[PDB]
Write a protein that binds this ligand. Structure first.
Ligand SMILES: [Ca+2]
Lengths: 148, 132
C-alpha cells in the first residue's frame, strides 16, 4: 500500500486480514466471521444475506472433540449454501492448546481441504486468499468476453 | 433531452465502494457498453454519480451483469449530505441486463447501490441518466 491497484474483499467463516497476492499488485481483504463473535450470526440474519462460501476450520491437536466438531461444521456449511453451483472452499488448521495429524491430513485430503499445522503461519490465509483471487481473475475475464 | 451521466457532458463518479484499476468507475460513463466497472467482492457495493448540474431527470437506465438487486437514490443539494430513495428493484438472473426506469425527480447526485448479486462479483457497464 500504495502500490495496490485493486483491493478484493472476501467473506470467511472462521470456526479484516489483508493479504497481498504475489507476484501481483492486488490486495485481498479477508472478512473473518468468527462464529461466536457473533459476526457470522449478524450476517446470516441480515437482509440480503448471501450465504458463506469460504471457511477456515481450526482444531486443537489434543482434542479429538474439536476436530470432529470441525467435520460437522464443514458438512453443515456445505449443506447451508444457497447456491449449489459455487463450491465451499475450506482450509483445515491444526493448532495447540487426542488428534492424529496423520489422520487429520488425510480426511482433509480425501475432502479437498488444504491442511496447515500451526503448533508450534499466515499460510491458511494466503491459501484462502489466492483461491479467491483465482475466481476473481476468471469471472473478470468471462465478463469481458460476455460483453463484446 | 440529454444524457448527463455521459461524461463528455460532465458526468463523474465520486464515491465508489470498490475499485480495480483495470475496471474503474469511469467505464460506466463512456457510452460504450463493452467496458465496465466491476465489484470486487461482498455486497452491497455502491457508487455516487455527480451531474454537471442539478437536472430534472426523466429516465434512469442501467446496463449490468450479475446484479440481483439494485437501489437508486438522489440528492439535489450541492454537497451529497442527505440522499433520498427513488427506487429499488430485483433483477432476473441472466448475459447482460438492462433496467430502464421512467422517473420524475430532480438530482445533482445519484447513488447506485448494488444490494446483492447473483454471484460473487457483478459489473455495471452503463449508467445513463436523461433529462434537462
Ligand atoms: Ca461502459
Amino acid at each position: 500500500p500504495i502500490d495496490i491497484t485493486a483491493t478484493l474483499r472476501c467473506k470467511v467463516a472462521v470456526v479484516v486480514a489483508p493479504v497481498t497476492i504475489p507476484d501481483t499488485t492486488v490486495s485481498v481483504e479477508l472478512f473473518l466471521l468468527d462464529t461466536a463473535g457473533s459476526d457470522l450470526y449478524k450476517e446470516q440474519i441480515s437482509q440480503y444475506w448471501n450465504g458463506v462460501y469460504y471457511a477456515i476450520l481450526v482444531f486443537d491437536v489434543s482434542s479429538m472433540e474439536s476436530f470432529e466438531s470441525c467435520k460437522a461444521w464443514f458438512e453443515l456449511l456445505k449443506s447451508a449454501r444457497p447456491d449449489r453451483e459455487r463450491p465451499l472452499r475450506a482450509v483445515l488448521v491444526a493448532n495447540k492448546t487426542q488428534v492424529r495429524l496423520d489422520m487429520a491430513q488425510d480426511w482433509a485430503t480425501t475432502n479437498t481441504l488444504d491442511f496447515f499445522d500451526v503448533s508450534a503461519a499466515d499460510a491458511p490465509f494466503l491459501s484462502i486468499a489466492t483461491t479467491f483471487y483465482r475466481n476473481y481473475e476468471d469471472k473478470v475475464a468471462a465478463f469481458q468476453d460476455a460483453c463484446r | 433531452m440529454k444524457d448527463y451521466a455521459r461524461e463528455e457532458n460532465g458526468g463523474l463518479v465520486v464515491m465508489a465502494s470498490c475499485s480495480d484499476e483495470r475496471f474503474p468507475p469511469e467505464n460506466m460513463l463512456d457510452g460504450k457498453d463493452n467496458t465496465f466497472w466491476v465489484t470486487t467482492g461482498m455486497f452491497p457495493q455502491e457508487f455516487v454519480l455527480r451531474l454537471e448540474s442539478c437536472i430534472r431527470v426523466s429516465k434512469i437506465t442501467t446496463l449490468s451483469l450479475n446484479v440481483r438487486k439494485l437501489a437508486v437514490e438522489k440528492c439535489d443539494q450541492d454537497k451529497p449530505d442527505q440522499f433520498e430513495k427513488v427506487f429499488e428493484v430485483e433483477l432476473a438472473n441472466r448475459r447482460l441486463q438492462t433496467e430502464v426506469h421512467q422517473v420524475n425527480i430532480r438530482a445533482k447526485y445519484l447513488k447506485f447501490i448494488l444490494l446483492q448479486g447473483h454471484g460473487e462479483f457483478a459489473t455495471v457497464n452503463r449508467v445513463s441518466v436523461v433529462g434537462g
